């Protein structure tokens, strides 16, 4: 109530530009506020550049709740979502 199962998920397996922008935002904001970093910073200091590395190496522990117009939703982990662009 409401939801959709892990099986039968019609929404794009590809992460949106808006999904990427918000995910990089939330993470960059956490990093900038002394939250722990899930990757080896190779001389990196910029919170956003760090969030980008964490994205590239798929260690961002977030879930995009995708809503459909009926009110139902599909949960997609950052790790499962394909990041082409």
């Amino acid at each position: 109530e409401k939801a959709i199962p892990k099986d039968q998920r019609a929404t794009t397996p590809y992460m949106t530009k808006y999904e990427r922008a918000r995910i990089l935002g939330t993470r960059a904001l956490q990093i900038s506020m002394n939250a722990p970093v899930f990757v080896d910073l190779e001389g990196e200091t910029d919170p956003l550049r760090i969030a980008m590395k964490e994205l590239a190496e798929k260690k961002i522990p977030l879930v995009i709740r995708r809503y459909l117009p009926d009110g139902s939703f599909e949960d997609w982990s950052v790790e499962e979502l394909i990041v082409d662009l």
Partner: protein, 196 residues
């Protein structure tokens, strides 16, 4: 601005040595773009220049009066009589290298006007400051330290970009933002908040 409806700003200033130079060693006080000519079709600008070049050389005033028999040819004769190419073109050298330019420059005097409204009278910037009495919004005007307008048109551009949070921030953290107490029953701002 020139006397031909051709307003323009200083892009940069170069000292004499960087400026392109003539064989007599004359240097422009100003450099206007060739592209400012075709579309505008302000041919009189080109004529004014030619005439003014002849005027300064001959120590006579130029007749720029309208309905007359003063021809571009007529002027071009008088300029050649002075040992300059008849159409205002001049061999110029690059100020950096001293190398001749492959292109000859249309040079000579032209009346220009210093117009009011100068950068320093226009520059504004506000990172928080005075707030309007009623709206609790940034004030209006540079000479009051007012906030620049992020109108509905700008609001539109941000929706198009899908920048939901930037839009929330421009309209809350910057400018406005307020905390009100609501009743879960009536839903009105009635709640007489005795904070602390």
């Amino acid at each position: 601005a020139s006397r031909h409806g051709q307003k323009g700003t200083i892009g940069i200033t170069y000292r004499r040595e960087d400026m392109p130079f003539t064989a007599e060693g004359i240097v422009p006080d100003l450099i206007i773009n060739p592209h400012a000519i075709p579309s505008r079709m302000t041919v009189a600008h080109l004529i004014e220049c030619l005439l003014s070049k002849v005027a300064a050389l001959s120590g006579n005033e130029g007749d720029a009066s309208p309905f007359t028999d003063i021809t571009v040819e007529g002027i071009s004769k008088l300029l050649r009589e002075h040992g300059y190419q008849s159409r205002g073109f001049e061999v110029m050298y690059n100020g950096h290298t001293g190398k001749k330019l492959m292109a000859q420059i249309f040079f000579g005097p032209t009346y220009y006007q210093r117009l009011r409204h100068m950068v320093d009278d226009k520059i504004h910037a506000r990172a928080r400051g005075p707030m309007q009495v009623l709206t609790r919004q940034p004030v209006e005007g540079r000479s009051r330290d007012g906030g620049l307008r992020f109108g509905e048109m700008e609001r539109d551009c941000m929706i198009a970009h899908g920048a939901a949070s930037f839009l929330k921030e421009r309209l809350m953290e910057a400018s406005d933002a307020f905390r009100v107490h609501i009743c879960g029953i009536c839903g009105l701002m009635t709640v007489i908040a005795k904070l602390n």
